[PDB]
Amino acid sequence: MISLADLQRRIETGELSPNAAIAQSHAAIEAREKEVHAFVRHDKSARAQASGPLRGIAVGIKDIIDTANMPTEMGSEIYRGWQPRSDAPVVMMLKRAGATIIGKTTTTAFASRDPTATLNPHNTGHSPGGSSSGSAAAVGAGMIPLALGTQTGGSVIQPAAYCGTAAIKPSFRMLPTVGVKCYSWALDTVGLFGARAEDLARGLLAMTGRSEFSGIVPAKAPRIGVVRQEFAGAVEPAAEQGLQAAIKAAERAGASVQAIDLPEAVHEAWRIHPIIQDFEAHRALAWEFSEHHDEIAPMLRASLDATVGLTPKEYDEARRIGRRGRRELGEVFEGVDVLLTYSAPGTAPAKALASTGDPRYNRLWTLMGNPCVNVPVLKVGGLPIGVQVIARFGNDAHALATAWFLEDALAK
Amino acid sequence: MISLADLQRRIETGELSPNAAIAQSHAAIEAREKEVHAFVRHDKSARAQASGPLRGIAVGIKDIIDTANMPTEMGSEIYRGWQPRSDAPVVMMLKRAGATIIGKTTTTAFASRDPTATLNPHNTGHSPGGSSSGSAAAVGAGMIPLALGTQTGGSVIQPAAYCGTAAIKPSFRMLPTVGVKCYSWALDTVGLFGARAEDLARGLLAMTGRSEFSGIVPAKAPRIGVVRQEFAGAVEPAAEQGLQAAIKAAERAGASVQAIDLPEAVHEAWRIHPIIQDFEAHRALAWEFSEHHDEIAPMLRASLDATVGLTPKEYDEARRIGRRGRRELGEVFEGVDVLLTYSAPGTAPAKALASTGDPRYNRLWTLMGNPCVNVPVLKVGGLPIGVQVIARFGNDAHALATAWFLEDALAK
C-alpha cells in the first residue's frame, strides 16, 4: 500500500517529484487491474498538479460520485455513459488541494448489495466487500494512496477491513453528499480509504482545511470501551481473533481497556436502521424504481420490492428510536475516549457466495453518525481482519489519533 | 388563483375529468405567460394521468429541481440545455400521486440574488420575489394549482407574500433535497405554492402519504404569539399594516394573541445564518466558482467573491449557535401554538431596483427548520402583503390549520 503522508513528505522535501508519484500510481494500476478490476475507468492521461498539499497524490472516486471529465455510471446499466456536468463538491475539495483524479473506482449498483466484478487484492477468489468495492480494493492493492467511497450500511468500514486498508467514515454530514448518488439521506456519509490513519488525517486536512486534522499525533493512554455488539448477532471466530489481538496490543501500549454493554436505546437504534434506510431508498430511487424497475440489479430490486410497504408512520417511529439512540450513546462516552468493536463479521466472503458481506456490525454507527476508523489488525488464512475505532460525534480527530495509536501498538 | 383542493373534489365526484383540468392549466398558462414570464419551459404536451389523488393537477417546478423529460438549467447560462438523467425524488412524489408536471418555472441563477425576467402578477412593474420567482408568479397569476420552490433564506415565503399566494416551507428535511441544486445543505428546504392553506395540505398529503396532512380543518381559537423580529430592524409601513390587520382579524375571530420576545439565543441564530449559508455555498458551488467564475451571474459572483475567506472555525461556531437557538426556540412553543410574524419587508420592490427583496425576516426560520406558511392579508397600491404562520418543528399540520383559520378570519 502507498502512504499518502509519505508521498506528501517526500514531495514536500523535493525528495520525490509529483510527476513521479503520479507515474507510480499509473504503473501500479496497470500492474494489477487485469487481476483486481478495481476501476470502472482509468484516465491514463492524468497528470500531477503544480501546487497544493495533494499535488502528486492520485485519487480514485467511487462511481456514484459525480465527475465532470469522466462518466459516473452508478454501477448500473441505467446510467451507462451518463456524464455529470460538474464535479461533486468532495471531488472539488480534492482538486482544489492539488490532487489528481486518476479514475472512477467500481461501485455496486446504486451502492447496494449486488456484487461487482472487482476481486479482493489479498485473494482473487474472495470479495473485496461493498459497496465501495473498487476504492478499498484499489487502495489495498497498492494502486493508489487515496480513494473516496460512501457508507449507508457499512460500505466504507467493512470493505476496508476486508481489503486490509485504513479507512474512515467521518461524522455524519461533515463532508457534503452533494453530487453523491443518494441511497438514504439520513445515512449517506462520504468516506476515505488510505494506508494508515495518518494518511486519512492528512487527506481530510487538505479537503476541509479544518485545524482539528492538522498535526495529529498518536493518542496516549487512550481510554477504550470494548463493545461486541451482541444485538448484531453471532460474530465469526476470525473477527473475535482480531479484536482480542487489538485489545491485547493496546493494553501493552498503556491503553485502559474495559468491556461495556451498550444501552437498550442503542440496541433498538441498530434494529431500526433498515427501516430508515429502506423507506428513504424508495423515495431516493423513485425514478429508477418506477421507470426502470427491471433494469435495477437483482439484489437491489429484490429488497426494494420487499419494502414497498414501509409506512411514513413506522418510518417516523424508527427515527424517534434513532434519536433516542444518539442521546443515550453520548453518555457512554463519559467514561471512555473511544469504542472498539468489529469492522465486519469475519474474513471477506469467497466470491462464489455471491455476497459482499453483512454490514450488521457497521450500520448502527452510520445512523448514530459518529466517526469510525478501520484499523487493520491481522490476517487469517490470508484474508485481512480489522477492528473499528469509534469516537464521540464531531470528534473525528481523536478517532484517527487512537487508530494511529492502535497501529503503532499492533506493530509492537 | 386555481385551488388544488377544489379541482380535486370536482374531479373526485366526476364533475370534472382530469383531461379537462389539465386543459384548464394549459389555457390559464397560455393566457398570462406572455406577460408574466413565469416559465423557463412550458410542456404543452403534458397530459393528465388516469389515477391518483393528484390526477388532473398541473404543477410547476422551480428550475433547480431535476426533471427527466425537461431541461434543468438552474437559471444559469452555465447549465444551458442541461438535461438531468432522472426526476428528482420530490418530482416523483408528484408523478406517483397522479399529478402532471406541466413545466419548469423560473429560478434566479443557482437560486441566489440575480433577478429573473419574471414579473409580479399583480403589477408587471414589480418583482415577484425570489428565488422561486416562477412558481410564485405562476400560482399568483392563476396559471396552475400547485408549484414547488426552495428556501435557503426566504425563497418560498417571501415571493409567496409578494405574489399573494399561500405557501409552506415544510419542516427541514421532511421533503428530500435529492436532485435539488444545492446552495446550503444545512438550509435548503423544498416548499410548495398554492391558492390557500388547504391546497398546500392536500399537496403534502398526496406527496408524502403522512396522516398528519389528512383531514386537516381550520384551527379553533388558536393561541398565537406575535414576534416582530426586532433583530432584523424595523419593517416597511405596508408590512406592519398587514400584521396589524392580521392580529385584529385573528382576535376578532376568537384567537388569543400575545406579543412575545424571542430568546437571545434565537436572535444570535438569525445573526449567523449568512455564515452557514455562504460558507457552504462555497463548497456546494465549488465547481462553478472554480471552472466558470466569470459565467456566474453578477450578484451571486460578488457575494461568493466576498465570502471566499470564511473559515471552518467561524463556521462550526455558527452551527453551534444555530443549535442552541433551536433548543430555546422550542421552549417558546410551550405557551403558544404558533408564531405570527412578517413574510417580507413590505410590498414587492419595483423591478427598476433590480432586487428580489431582503429575506431578513425569513432566514432565521429556515435555519431553525420550523414549518412556515404565508397568509395573504391585504394589498397596498395593489401590491400583496402577507404574514407568516410558524409552528414548532414537526407541526406542519398545525401550521396549515392555523393558516386556514387566519384565512377565514381575514375573510371575516
Side-chain angles (χ1 to χ4, degrees):
Chain A
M1 296 194 279
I2 314 173
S3 167
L4 183 160
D6 187 31
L7 292 181
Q8 275 206 316
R9 282 188 288 270
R10 285 201 288 151
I11 287 175
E12 186 68 307
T13 63
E15 205 188 272
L16 174 61
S17 65
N19 288 309
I22 294 305
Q24 291 168 42
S25 291
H26 284 293
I29 295 177
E30 289 293 302
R32 303 190 68 190
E33 258 308 272
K34 297 189 174 184
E35 168 198 0
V36 181
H37 311 97
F39 288 83
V40 176
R41 66 191 61 270
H42 170 191
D43 173 26
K44 301 233 61 180
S45 63
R47 305 186 96 289
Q49 288 197 68
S51 67
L54 292 183
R55 59 184 184 293
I57 306 304
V59 185
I61 306 303
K62 181 169 177 170
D63 210 33
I64 60 167
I65 299 173
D66 286 0
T67 46
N69 66 307
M70 290 174 256
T72 302
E73 307 180 304
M74 321 295 177
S76 170
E77 327 159 311
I78 292 176
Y79 289 74
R80 179 192 191 180
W82 175 238
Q83 183 51 258
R85 178 98 174 82
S86 62
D87 286 306
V90 287
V91 173
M92 288 303 297
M93 293 181 160
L94 296 169
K95 302 207 315 175
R96 284 186 170 187
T100 292
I101 305 301
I102 199 164
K104 307 299 296 300
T105 55
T106 67
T107 164
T108 53
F110 304 117
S112 198
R113 277 307 208 73
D114 294 283
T116 68
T118 306
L119 306 170
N120 191 301
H122 300 279
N123 197 316
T124 291
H126 290 260
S127 164
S131 51
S132 305
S133 300
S135 298
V139 177
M143 299 181 170
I144 54 180
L146 189 69
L148 292 187
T150 66
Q151 180 159 306
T152 300
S155 294
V156 172
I157 296 306
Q158 181 160 35
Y162 284 174
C163 297
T165 79
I168 176 179
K169 182 204 70 63
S171 297
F172 182 57
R173 295 176 74 84
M174 204 238 80
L175 295 173
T177 47
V178 176
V180 182
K181 192 63 179 153
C182 177
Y183 191 111
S184 178
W185 61 86
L187 299 162
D188 291 356
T189 307
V190 185
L192 276 60
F193 294 76
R196 304 191 63 183
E198 162 175 44
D199 307 313
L200 298 179
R202 300 305 292 178
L204 283 183
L205 174 68
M207 294 175 78
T208 69
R210 302 181 68 89
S211 63
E212 38 277 88
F213 298 123
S214 177
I216 288 180
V217 55
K220 286 294 186 299
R223 298 179 174 179
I224 307 173
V226 177
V227 290
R228 295 188 162 64
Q229 299 186 61
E230 312 73 7
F231 44 82
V235 78
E236 291 171 41
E240 172 67 11
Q241 283 167 49
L243 184 61
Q244 276 179 60
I247 289 177
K248 187 177 180 306
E251 284 174 353
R252 302 302 182 183
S256 74
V257 185
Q258 69 180 305
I260 59 184
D261 292 306
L262 293 165
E264 171 57 17
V266 172
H267 296 204
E268 272 295 74
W270 172 87
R271 179 180 67 77
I272 59 80
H273 172 286
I275 309 305
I276 292 172
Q277 183 190 89
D278 296 342
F279 179 87
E280 303 197 332
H282 270 287
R283 271 71 263 172
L285 298 174
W287 180 77
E288 291 81 340
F289 190 76
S290 299
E291 314 295 18
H292 304 280
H293 183 278
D294 299 358
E295 280 166 271
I296 301 179
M299 306 202 175
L300 175 51
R301 189 167 73 244
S303 70
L304 288 165
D305 279 354
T307 59
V308 298
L310 295 178
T311 65
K313 179 166 178 292
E314 66 185 302
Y315 161 69
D316 287 340
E317 184 53 52
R319 293 186 295 117
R320 310 174 187 295
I321 299 177
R323 286 171 304 209
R324 275 183 185 60
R326 301 190 193 79
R327 178 164 47 266
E328 285 185 40
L329 173 57
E331 298 171 359
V332 174
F333 282 104
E334 303 195 312
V336 302
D337 305 318
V338 300
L339 300 178
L340 177 56
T341 191
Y342 308 115
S343 291
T347 59
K351 286 284 297 191
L353 288 182
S355 175
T356 57
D358 188 356
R360 62 180 191 275
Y361 298 90
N362 307 287
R363 67 190 225 199
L364 166 66
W365 315 114
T366 307
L367 178 65
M368 295 298 91
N370 305 61
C372 305
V373 182
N374 175 260
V375 169
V377 174
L378 52 76
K379 297 166 66 179
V380 184
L383 295 306
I385 280 292
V387 295
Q388 170 172 25
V389 173
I390 312 170
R392 182 190 298 290
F393 184 83
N395 237 271
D396 307 60
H398 198 187
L400 290 163
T402 302
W404 196 327
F405 157 88
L406 218 189
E407 302 187 318
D408 296 335
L410 292 170
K412 296 299 80 183
Chain B
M1 299 187 287
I2 301 178
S3 166
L4 153 49
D6 174 59
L7 291 172
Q8 195 178 312
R9 280 189 284 266
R10 287 197 292 155
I11 295 183
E12 180 60 5
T13 56
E15 171 178 350
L16 186 57
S17 71
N19 291 307
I22 300 300
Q24 240 85 112
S25 304
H26 285 296
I29 295 178
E30 216 51 280
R32 311 274 274 89
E33 177 60 7
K34 287 179 181 178
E35 57 158 336
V36 171
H37 312 146
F39 284 84
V40 177
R41 297 179 184 301
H42 174 197
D43 181 3
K44 290 182 176 57
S45 68
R47 310 195 82 278
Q49 295 191 59
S51 64
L54 298 180
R55 60 186 186 291
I57 300 297
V59 185
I61 307 298
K62 186 172 178 175
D63 210 37
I64 49 167
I65 306 176
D66 292 352
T67 48
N69 67 322
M70 289 178 262
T72 305
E73 309 183 308
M74 321 300 178
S76 173
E77 47 191 277
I78 297 172
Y79 286 78
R80 183 80 175 76
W82 174 243
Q83 180 55 256
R85 171 55 164 145
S86 60
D87 284 309
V90 286
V91 171
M92 284 307 298
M93 297 181 144
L94 288 169
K95 296 213 306 177
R96 286 179 168 185
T100 295
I101 304 304
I102 203 166
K104 311 304 295 294
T105 55
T106 61
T107 176
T108 52
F110 305 107
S112 190
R113 295 182 305 115
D114 294 280
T116 66
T118 299
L119 305 173
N120 192 308
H122 300 278
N123 188 304
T124 60
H126 290 251
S127 164
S131 52
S132 303
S133 305
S135 294
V139 173
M143 291 182 197
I144 55 189
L146 192 74
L148 296 186
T150 64
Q151 179 158 310
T152 300
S155 299
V156 168
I157 299 298
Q158 182 160 26
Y162 282 173
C163 297
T165 80
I168 175 173
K169 170 207 133 305
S171 296
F172 184 60
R173 289 186 291 189
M174 178 188 93
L175 299 175
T177 48
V178 176
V180 184
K181 186 57 174 166
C182 176
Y183 191 100
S184 177
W185 61 84
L187 293 165
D188 298 349
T189 310
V190 177
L192 283 67
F193 294 83
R196 302 185 55 186
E198 166 180 38
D199 304 300
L200 302 179
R202 287 273 107 193
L204 288 178
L205 172 60
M207 287 175 78
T208 67
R210 309 189 64 183
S211 67
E212 62 172 295
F213 295 123
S214 184
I216 289 180
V217 157
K220 299 300 176 183
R223 297 180 166 182
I224 305 170
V226 180
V227 296
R228 290 192 166 72
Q229 308 185 62
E230 304 73 15
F231 39 87
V235 81
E236 288 164 40
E240 172 61 18
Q241 289 166 54
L243 183 55
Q244 277 179 45
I247 293 177
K248 185 178 182 305
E251 286 172 350
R252 221 178 76 178
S256 60
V257 183
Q258 56 180 298
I260 305 176
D261 282 300
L262 293 170
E264 176 55 43
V266 177
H267 297 202
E268 275 301 73
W270 173 91
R271 184 180 71 75
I272 54 76
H273 171 289
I275 305 297
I276 297 178
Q277 181 192 74
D278 302 342
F279 180 76
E280 303 194 326
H282 269 288
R283 307 328 130 192
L285 298 172
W287 177 79
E288 293 81 355
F289 188 73
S290 297
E291 304 291 10
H292 305 273
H293 179 284
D294 295 319
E295 288 156 274
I296 293 181
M299 294 185 220
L300 175 54
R301 191 200 312 153
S303 61
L304 283 169
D305 277 350
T307 56
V308 177
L310 292 176
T311 76
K313 177 169 176 179
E314 58 187 310
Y315 169 61
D316 296 322
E317 189 54 61
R319 291 197 288 91
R320 179 184 310 140
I321 291 178
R323 285 193 293 284
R324 174 162 50 247
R326 293 201 183 84
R327 275 202 293 286
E328 282 164 52
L329 174 57
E331 301 200 61
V332 181
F333 291 97
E334 304 189 308
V336 180
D337 304 303
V338 302
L339 297 180
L340 178 57
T341 188
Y342 306 103
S343 284
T347 47
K351 289 291 293 190
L353 298 183
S355 165
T356 53
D358 181 353
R360 63 176 187 271
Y361 302 94
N362 299 291
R363 77 192 210 194
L364 172 70
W365 317 110
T366 298
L367 173 52
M368 299 293 94
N370 301 63
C372 312
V373 190
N374 179 72
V375 180
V377 189
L378 59 294
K379 299 158 68 179
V380 183
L383 290 311
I385 288 293
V387 288
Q388 170 167 32
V389 180
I390 313 174
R392 330 180 325 81
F393 188 73
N395 271 57
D396 302 53
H398 180 52
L400 292 163
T402 295
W404 192 337
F405 157 83
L406 210 188
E407 294 182 335
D408 297 320
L410 288 174
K412 305 308 172 183

